[PDB]
């Protein structure tokens, strides 16, 4: 299936790990033009495959915190391409402020995850229009199903839910389409460090596999980064507003299966 | 972004008008082998069309209000190919069955309806089992929105959301995925009969699509088609209960946008 | 909380047992008059309860699956009483109709779920149009979560859900409101009679209770009542179309937690 | 129905105006004591008549931004009163901050909206745990429809759904309940100052009203305010996660109707 991505330029925030490097890499292998917005550099074997399915991709390091650098960052982008096509919203941290945090705590995971979101669409927007082109933010089922111990994240999440919903309908006679994904367990480095926080993190993962409906197993990275694309291409030309669940059946299906 | 669809074997009910043709020209483009359950012959181009893409494309007459056809149908296609890889529950009429209408209509919708989306599983199951293949069920927006006097068809496009669900609880271990595509206003010979039972079709037809937030226009076949074989597709390999609205924001978004 | 729902003529769908049950002696409570429709002899012991609480409470044996019962119990009701208030669906049984059981047990399973909320729906709407009624609908948790082996009633729940999206447009002007309890986890007689076919019922039982989120313990089937009945009084006199969730967690909260 | 609230008491945060001040005046109906939390002294004739119905209804004066005065206002009532039996989170405002406004415009309607719901749960939450008490968050439809114009606005209500997943995760060990309402349209002060930002005031609110399907007029604080005690008392002690529409069909029905 052809997603006529070919030379589209589509920033990806975190885009350099986890689910953030696979969209990145089912991108290039588009021929879309991916341009990592991350804190920390790019391995080398990642930059190596991403240059050899499109050697225009590119890196540019930004602390996404910091309004200035979103900002510098995406005037730099159009700066070297000229045109921006897509804005994926995916830098994100499971940062455990819960209930017993306080405000200023709560904040900061508001910084960490939901601000820049709003900061990338406010830079990336007039660019979007001149080019018809789409959001996709990357929310979580907590957004939905709660977790425990994550009041700021999970208020992250769902804000992220929320502004797909006002994003779609401010932005509807631009042809500008906005959707969300939403992923419940996928194994990434993010995840590897937030089940190391727990008493016993091999168990506490095998339980939780357990959990997921469809195989027992996490979703992967590739399966989420492929309905993120799918969601930026002409595709899904008249998907807007839309919140897809990638997730094996986890937050939907009976509580009770086994 | 490739499907992996290659000489996979799908059964379109209502396969070669509207929504159906689509999705069937969409499976040939892939070189999926769709296999068209209809009750009236499709027309010489289309066949023609399907035919250049995947020559192995075939069509089976079947009222599929008939059990025996329809069992008769899945044993014939089995026959012929070897294996089953999809189903698309897609053929349906709004029918106008309403609060009014009396128990015999409104059974006569649900077998109109409802009643062979089930059938259909029933006999596809076993075969879907071995390949590990996959269903999607073509609902409507009308099962979460209502529309007045239409009591059968909302039912039953409600019992298929319902059905989609309960399905991919059912199948989870033998890695069969079951999802759903909610179209709201797409153009199709349906849609034209429809639109027709109204005492100014022009004024009707022209008065909802001012109401599709994305564009002010119908949704196309082929985009509802393109999301219905992505979801057919290994490319949605973690992707299943689930329920994907194509309809342009006409469900989700707020109804006071003009 | 005064409820207005004095003299009130309620018609409420096997009505004496478990849920249904519950339903009835909250109206009677609130001196609205209940109308068991109901196959089987109410307990003496409940009738007795009832008639104390309101000595107008009736009871009609009526085998629900047979329009022409519907037909004359609802035209019974009303030369007793000369007007009806509100419709109750409830009557219904998870009869464990899957994938393998065919066309036939579907249909039945429909038969004895959905049809008769439509039957009745339309049996008793001119009544409830004349006193701007309400109707509530009992659905089930499996309309959205699925369950597995329970096709037939899945379906039904299903449909009931999107019947009472449509009857709530369709009523809109007529002031009728159209709304649907959902419940998880109930104990009533259908329940022991359900747990019961089960290898384990005691184990099956605890290991069913330790999966919801509130307390770990079965919803009441007073639970389910008060929200049924708000939803019938005019204190929730601007919600229409809705689908109130009483499962204790059961449906939307992380299917991980303990 | 006795809702059981009687000397409950509960802190409603904009309490005397709008949709809080219905609220407090159905608390003091139902003999619970409500303490309002609001900056500016409420009417005197709406305190004359909480007074009448619960004499020992309270006020204190608190800027909801500024977390010490959440802190000791919480502190207050529970030297006072001892207990702590509900906390509803109201007080907000629709600021208009769309897309174009930038980063500080962003936060600060954050600030106005989302942060001092969390900051207010921080406070109450150790002594409803001791109450087994309950949490209602007042949201907005907007938070699932969008609005257009309102990024800052919407990103908080839909914080405040997620919260409510998330806390009713926390705290169903406490037997903590935790529920929001969502309204759509709702003739308040806030609705009366919003409006008065179009440029035809009073041609834009019919235009609104015309779109609720039932009835085609606002609801009210009145019954907004039922459907949030209802939420507070025992009669809904199952029901805790969940987002319960108050809004005249607003949200879910046919966008089509007239
Ligand atoms: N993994 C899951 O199970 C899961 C489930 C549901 C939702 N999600 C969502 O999916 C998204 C991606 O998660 P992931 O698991 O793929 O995480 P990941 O592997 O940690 O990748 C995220 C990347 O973003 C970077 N990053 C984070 N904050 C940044 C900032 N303020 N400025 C610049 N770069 C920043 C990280 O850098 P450093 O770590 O090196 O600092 C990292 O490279 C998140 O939004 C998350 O909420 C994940
Ligand atoms: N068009 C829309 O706006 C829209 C919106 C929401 C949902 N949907 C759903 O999308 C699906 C397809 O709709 P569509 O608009 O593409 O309809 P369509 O153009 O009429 O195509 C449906 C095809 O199915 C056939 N068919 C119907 N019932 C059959 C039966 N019992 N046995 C054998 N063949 C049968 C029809 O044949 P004949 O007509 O020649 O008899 C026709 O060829 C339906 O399930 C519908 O509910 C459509
Ligand atoms: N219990 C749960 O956990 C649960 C959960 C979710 C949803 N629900 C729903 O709640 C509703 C009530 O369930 P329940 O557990 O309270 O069941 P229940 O105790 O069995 O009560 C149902 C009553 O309806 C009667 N009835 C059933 N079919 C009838 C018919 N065709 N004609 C006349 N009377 C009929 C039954 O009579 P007989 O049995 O004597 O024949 C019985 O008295 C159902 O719609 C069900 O789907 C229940
Ligand atoms: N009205 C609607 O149509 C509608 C629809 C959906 C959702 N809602 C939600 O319903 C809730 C109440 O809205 P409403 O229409 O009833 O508004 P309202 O009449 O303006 O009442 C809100 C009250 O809260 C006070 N307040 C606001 N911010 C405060 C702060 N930081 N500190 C202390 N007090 C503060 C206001 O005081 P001052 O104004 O005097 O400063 C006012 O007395 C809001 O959360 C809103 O989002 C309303
Ligand atoms: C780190 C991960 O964050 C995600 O949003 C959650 O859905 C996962 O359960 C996990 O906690
Ligand atoms: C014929 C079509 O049926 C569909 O299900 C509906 O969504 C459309 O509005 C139209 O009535
Ligand atoms: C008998 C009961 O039917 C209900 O609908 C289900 O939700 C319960 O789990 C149980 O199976
Ligand atoms: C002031 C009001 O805010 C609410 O949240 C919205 O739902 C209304 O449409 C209006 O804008
Ligand atoms: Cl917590
Ligand atoms: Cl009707
Ligand atoms: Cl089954
Ligand atoms: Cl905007
Ligand atoms: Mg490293
Ligand atoms: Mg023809």
Redesign the interface.
């Known amino acids: 299936?052809?997603?006529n991505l070919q030379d589209k330029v589509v920033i990806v925030t975190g885009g350099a790990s986890g689910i953030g490097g696979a969209i990145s890499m089912?991108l290039a292998?588009?021929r879309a033009i991916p341009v990592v917005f991350a804190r920390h550099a790019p391995d080398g074997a990642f930059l190596d495959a991403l240059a050899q399915r499109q050697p225009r991709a590119t890196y540019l390091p930004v602390e996404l915190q910091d309004?200035a650098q979103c900002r510098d960052a995406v005037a730099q982008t159009i700066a070297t391409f000229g045109r921006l096509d897509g804005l994926v919203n995916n830098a994100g941290v499971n940062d455990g402020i819960?209930?017993?945090?306080?405000?200023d705590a709560?904040?900061a995971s508001?910084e960490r995850n939901?601000?820049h979101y709003?900061?990338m669409?406010?830079y990336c927007?007039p660019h979007l229009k001149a080019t018809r082109g789409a959001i996709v933010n990357i929310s979580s089922?907590?957004?939905?199903?709660?977790?425990?111990?994550?009041?700021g994240y999970?208020?992250?999440?769902?804000?992220?839910?929320?502004?797909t919903?006002?994003?779609?309908?401010?932005?509807?006679e631009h042809?500008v389409?906005v959707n969300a994904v939403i992923p419940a367990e996928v194994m990434t480095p993010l995840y590897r460090n937030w089940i190391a926080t727990f008493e016993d993190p091999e168990a506490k993962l095998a339980?939780?596999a357990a959990?997921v409906?469809?195989?027992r197993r996490f979703?992967?990275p590739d399966?989420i980064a492929?309905?993120a694309?799918?969601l930026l291409s002409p595709?899904?030309?008249?998907?807007?507003?839309?919140w897809?669940?990638?997730?094996?059946?986890?937050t939907?299906?009976?509580?009770?299966?086994v």
């Open positions: 299936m052809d997603l089912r292998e588009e309004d819960g209930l017993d945090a306080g405000r709560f904040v508001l939901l601000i709003y900061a669409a406010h927007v089922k907590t957004a939905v199903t709660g977790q425990g111990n994550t009041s999970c208020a992250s999440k769902g804000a992220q839910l929320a502004l919903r006002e994003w779609a309908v401010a932005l509807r042809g389409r339980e939780i959990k409906p469809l195989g979703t992967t399966e492929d309905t694309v799918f595709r899904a030309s008249h998907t807007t507003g839309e897809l669940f990638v997730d094996g059946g986890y939907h299906l009976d509580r009770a299966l």
